[PDB]
């Protein structure tokens, strides 16, 4: 329960708790300020500090809420790009902590759904703002994420293979070819696709797949 001081003294306080690395307390302060003075003269910097603090404090779905509100009320803001970048970082953290909570006991075909969300976010950034100071890094991450995503496709195709579900296999790998043709996991999956076709006795198709496998050593 934040006391009833003037907006500026609360910001000052919020700033110190922020620099302190003391996230919860900054969030309390910033929150109160945001709620009490929504028409504040420096409300945006409040909203940015929150997004920042939720991220550091790992309140990722909360960070996402602030991000979303901010984008919609400030579509042309000079810093709209940082917000977007932050929104990617958010999902990417959700994803690291999903994998981390299942360490030593995971499934290869766990859906990395926060990774897909991250990917979504970062593309918007890099397509919308190619000259953004965050676009190099975001691109680096898109590459890493695309690879993770296709790898998931591979795991599903492998599972169905292990169970002679041949149609589920060609449908899956065909997906990989349509969506992630340029990933390692797609190259690994083609042998699965060839197998499923040879199994289904579809040799013309199977041989095309072979022709492709070979043209990519």
């Amino acid at each position: 329960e934040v006391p009833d001081n003037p907006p500026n003294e609360i910001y000052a306080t919020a700033q110190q708790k922020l620099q302190d690395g003391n996230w919860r307390q900054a969030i309390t302060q910033l929150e109160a300020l945001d709620n009490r003075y929504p028409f504040g003269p420096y409300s945006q910097q409040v909203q940015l500090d929150l997004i920042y603090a939720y991220y550091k404090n790992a309140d990722l779905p909360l960070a996402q809420a602030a991000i979303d509100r901010f984008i919609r009320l400030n579509p042309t803001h000079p810093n709209i790009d940082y917000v977007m970048y932050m929104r990617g970082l958010t999902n990417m953290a959700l994803d690291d902590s999903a994998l981390q909570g299942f360490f030593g006991v995971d499934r290869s075909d766990r859906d990395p759904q926060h990774a897909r969300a991250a990917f979504s976010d970062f593309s918007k950034l890099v397509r919308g703002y190619p000259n953004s100071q965050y676009t190099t890094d975001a691109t680096k991450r898109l590459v890493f994420l695309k690879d993770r995503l296709a790898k998931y496709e591979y795991s599903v195709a492998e599972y169905y293979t292990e169970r002679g579900a041949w149609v589920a296999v060609v449908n899956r790998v065909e997906g990989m070819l349509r969506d992630y043709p340029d990933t390692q996991a797609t190259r690994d999956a083609l042998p699965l696709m060839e197998n499923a076709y040879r199994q289904m006795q579809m040799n013309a198709q199977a041989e095309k797949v072979a022709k492709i496998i070979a043209a990519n050593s």
Binding site: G21, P41, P78, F119, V126, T136, K140, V143, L149, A214
Partner: protein, 182 residues
């Protein structure tokens, strides 16, 4: 400490991820180049990556003065106050103990010596050297802060992010000082 404060979470292992390659098409077969969702546009760059990238919110100058618009643009922050603001600014600067190295009272403009900054979120602290002035711009009036040079650990620094942060810091000191009287 305070690196963790300025830094993305997780590790840098994504920088290790192998480059993607377009799929070679056998003879007798054409293949679409990567396209649609999941297609990544080429960039080169190049801004900071991984732990070198500072994810603190961009410093936008505050309107700690009733009915006053602010703006930032390059290395210059400013504040449109709604005259004789010049002597007031001078006192705020003097109050904070910033040496002034030259002063044009008629021109309402001055240059500071190096100003030492000190924040808990920085591991090596910054120093900045400013040209401050009040332009009779309306009425109303404009108080502008220009970051001429910025130092850290003795080395010059000129990256946008930092220039904006520490152009904005001076502008804030001034605003707050203008508020704590008017």
């Amino acid at each position: 400490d305070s690196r963790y404060k300025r830094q993305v979470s997780g590790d840098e292992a994504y920088l290790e991820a192998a480059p993607l390659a377009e799929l070679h098409a056998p003879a007798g077969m054409i293949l679409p180049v990567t396209s649609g969702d999941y297609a990544i546009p080429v960039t080169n760059g190049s801004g900071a990556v991984g732990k070198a990238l500072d994810i603190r919110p961009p410093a936008q100058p505050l309107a700690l003065v009733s009915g006053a618009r602010t703006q930032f643009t390059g290395d210059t922050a400013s504040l449109l106050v709604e005259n004789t603001l010049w002597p007031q600014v001078v006192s705020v600067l003097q109050a904070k103990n910033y040496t002034i190295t030259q002063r044009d009272d008629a021109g309402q403009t001055l240059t500071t010596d190096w100003v030492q900054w000190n924040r808990l979120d920085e591991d090596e602290q910054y120093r900045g050297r400013y040209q401050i002035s009040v332009k009779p711009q309306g009425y109303q009036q404009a108080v502008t802060v220009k970051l001429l040079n910025l130092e850290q650990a003795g080395k010059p620094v000129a990256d946008a992010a930092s220039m904006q942060r520490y152009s904005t810091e001076m502008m804030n000191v001034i605003s707050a000082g203008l508020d704590k009287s008017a």
